[PDB]
Design a binder for these strands. Structure first.
Ligand code: NAD
Lengths: 206, 204
DNA sequence: CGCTGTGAACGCGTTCACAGCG
DNA sequence: CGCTGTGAACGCGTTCACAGCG
């Protein structure tokens, strides 16, 4: 009834497997196959899905197109979120060019404070100054991709919170302080690297 | 209890960053209470995570904890890294000036005939076919930044070449031998999690 | 007194056995 | 019968209780 956040991550993985199975022409799957491809047990797959509903067919398995649609629904992918990039350095510029956001995420703003950058035309847009967030965010942008230097993150975050942002995808190696009403999700490649260090040094534990 | 939760390692990483900051600020003494607040966990959490490895307290001396942590995390050595897939993300990573002294880029690989032989910061792009002749004793960690459809195969080549750890930036679940460590940095997953979080605020 | 270190209790996510239905 | 759906046990990871000690 109450969903652990570890399950949401696994649902994201199941949906990717379903998109792949569909691409391969597979119309039907099972908790066992789904588990095998996601490297989790069939038990876990069925438990994860049960948190939201009964999308399978007893004694048969799951119809790929159906589970796919249901998972996209649960995940909020059945809509078009408005996004923006704050910090047009190398990562931000790379993201503006990323051809993989799909139909669920649409870039609508690119902000920064550098005179050189501000004003530069980019894929589907043109860089603007951050103070224009209050006059660009409301009703148009729900999620912000935060790609500024570590020391500028928390600052940029406050400007986003005050601008009425709904969520922050944080790429900066720092814990952000935001009001509980604002969602934050971190993408930390340095932490990932350090975890590999620990893992490699502790094979037994791994 | 000596079965260190993987979730503790992530927090240790955060404690270290907090200590770096504190040291930068000129702070010398800290406590599990101040550390906790800064990491947004309880004082109980901090002390418990540290206890897994030892008794470094007295509170804590910023410089002493910082040293003990980067040691526990293996940051007291120079890891050899390589980038496989020199596209937009790969190139950005090659020029990132924030790896630190603990991580050294020693290889850049690709299959694009037009990128191989291409000079880059601290080296030149080589064909992935050269991995078996480049990884052993020089490169332990590979940053995997090739397209989704190419990731599993590239990981197979890195494994065969002797890689010890793979930092996977592709949205796929990699299959690798038990002895090869894998860590995912998945921004599309983070995006989708935010989507879910925004639609389920009560769920928090 | 104030703060650490750590067994033990506890709540929650995973595992499991089977109930439910096709 | 076969595979999904699920209530409950299990056990891992966080919280708690107190012991040590300057
Ligand atoms: N572009 C971005 O902003 C961005 C941001 C985050 C995550 N990513 C992820 O990064 C990965 C790469 O995306 P990109 O936009 O940089 O792609 P890209 O196509 O720019 O570059 C991928 C590079 O990999 C090379 N490649 C393909 N197969 C290879 C193989 N077997 N061995 C070695 N090199 C190979 C390609 O030739 C290309 O140079 C994807 O998984 C994507 O999801 C991209």
């Amino acid at each position: 009834m109450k969903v652990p956040e570890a399950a949401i991550s696994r649902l994201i993985t199941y949906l990717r497997i379903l998109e792949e199975l569909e691409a391969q022409g597979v119309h039907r799957t099972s908790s066992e196959q789904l588990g095998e491809l996601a490297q989790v047990t069939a038990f876990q797959v069925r438990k994860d899905l049960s948190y939201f509903g009964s999308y399978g067919t007893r004694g048969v398995g799951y119809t790929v197109p159906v589970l796919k649609r249901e998972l996209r629904h649960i995940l909020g992918l059945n809509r078009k979120w408005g996004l923006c990039i704050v910090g047009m350095g190398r990562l931000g510029s790379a993201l503006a060019d990323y051809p993989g956001f799909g139909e669920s995420f649409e870039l609508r703003g690119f902000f920064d404070v550098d005179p050189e950058k501000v004003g530069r035309p980019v894929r589907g847009g043109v860089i603007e100054h951050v103070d224009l967030l209050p006059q660009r965010v409301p009703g148009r942008i729900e999620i912000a991709l935060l790609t500024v230097p570590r020391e500028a993150a928390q600052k940029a975050a406050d400007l986003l919170v005050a601008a009425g942002i709904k969520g922050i995808l944080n790429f900066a190696p720092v814990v952000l302080e935001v009001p509980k009403e604002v969602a934050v999700e971190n993408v930390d490649f340095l932490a990932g690297l350090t975890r590999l260090s620990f893992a490699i040094l502790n094979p037994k534990w791994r």
